[PDB]
């Protein structure tokens, strides 16, 4: 189900360096900020 | 722009829905917020019968793995 899907996806994103970096370094607050200019 | 940032943002919304206001802590990293939320939801959901013991255990183990991968970048 959804709880499994989403945790597996997070695990998969943490398995590649670029996404791991984004997720570990970027604060929640900065998200709207980055998102605004995406 | 970047679809990688969009992939991360999209995933974040699965832990913190546009049913917006059960907000994450602004100063937490994205992965720290998501793992914290995953754990709280898995206990409540296991308690409530929405997930089974096998699903709960696998979720908690994945979280601890993810937490291991945070502490080393």
UniProtKB/Swiss-Prot annotation, chain A:
Subcellular localization, as worded in the UniProt entry: Virion; Host nucleus; Host mitochondrion
Top-level lineage group: Viruses
Membership in a protein family: Belongs to the influenza viruses PB2 family.
Quaternary structure (record): Influenza RNA polymerase is composed of three subunits: PB1, PB2 and PA. Interacts (via N-terminus) with PB1 (via C-terminus). Interacts with nucleoprotein NP (via N-terminus). Interacts (via N-terminus) with host MAVS (via N-terminus); this interaction inhibits host innate immune response.
Task performed by this protein: Plays an essential role in transcription initiation and cap-stealing mechanism, in which cellular capped pre-mRNAs are used to generate primers for viral transcription. Recognizes and binds the 7-methylguanosine-containing cap of the target pre-RNA which is subsequently cleaved after 10-13 nucleotides by the viral protein PA. Plays a role in the initiation of the viral genome replication and modulates the activity of the ribonucleoprotein (RNP) complex.
Descriptive protein name: Polymerase basic protein 2
Species the sequence originates in: Influenza A virus (strain A/Puerto Rico/8/1934 H1N1)
Curated annotation (Swiss-Prot), chain B:
PTM statement from Swiss-Prot or TrEMBL: Phosphorylated by host PRKCA.
Subcellular locations according to the entry: Host nucleus; Host cytoplasm
Domain of life: Viruses
Subunit and partners: Influenza RNA polymerase is composed of three subunits: PB1, PB2 and PA. Interacts (via N-terminus) with PA (via C-terminus). Interacts (via C-terminus) with PB2 (via N-terminus); this interaction is essential for transcription initiation. Interacts (via C-terminus) with human PKP2 (via N-terminus); the interaction competitively inhibits the interaction between the RNA polymerase subunits PB1 and PB2.
Role: RNA-dependent RNA polymerase which is responsible for replication and transcription of virus RNA segments. The transcription of viral mRNAs occurs by a unique mechanism called cap-snatching. 5' methylated caps of cellular mRNAs are cleaved after 10-13 nucleotides by PA. In turn, these short capped RNAs are used as primers by PB1 for transcription of viral mRNAs. During virus replication, PB1 initiates RNA synthesis and copy vRNA into complementary RNA (cRNA) which in turn serves as a template for the production of more vRNAs.
Membership in a protein family: Belongs to the influenza viruses polymerase PB1 family.
Protein name listed in UniProt: RNA-directed RNA polymerase catalytic subunit
Organism of provenance: Influenza A virus (strain A/Puerto Rico/8/1934 H1N1)
